[PDB]
Design a protein around this ligand. Structure first.
Ligand SMILES: [Cl-]
Length: 130
């Protein structure tokens, strides 16, 4: 499913992401924008290591979910990757909290460093009143 920006922002809002481990709603949104366009079914094959990034937050399969492919990957969020392609985004988000529980936090996403760090993020929340 494709969210309207502010729908997402408020849903994340409702699910406890604002300020979770220090990350504001706005950061999460910028992240979401560059990684998925607010689309739960977004995929990406990483030709580099054959991994595959899933859903609205483009969680990677090598370490965060299980998709059956690489027999040496880990699934730290203990969910099938497919549960990251659905309309309800609680799993995504939970898994998203777990990744930002790593010490690097949201800087684990490359797109967050290139697109949001030390840049304008309010924009992604402007008018959502969250
Ligand atoms: Cl993988």
């Amino acid at each position: 499913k494709v969210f309207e920006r502010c729908e997402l922002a408020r849903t994340l809002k409702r699910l406890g992401m604002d300020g979770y481990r220090g990350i504001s709603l706005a950061n999460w949104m910028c992240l979401a924008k560059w990684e998925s366009g607010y689309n739960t079914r977004a995929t990406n094959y990483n030709a580099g290591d054959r991994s595959t990034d899933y859903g609205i937050f483009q969680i990677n399969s090598r370490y965060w979910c299980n998709d059956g492919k690489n027999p040496g990957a880990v699934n730290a969020c203990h969910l099938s990757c497919s549960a990251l392609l659905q309309d309800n985004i609680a799993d995504a988000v939970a898994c998203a909290k777990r990744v930002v529980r790593d010490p690097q936090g949201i800087r684990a996403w490359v797109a967050w460093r290139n697109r949001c760090q030390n840049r304008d993020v309010r924009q992604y929340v402007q008018g959502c009143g969250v």
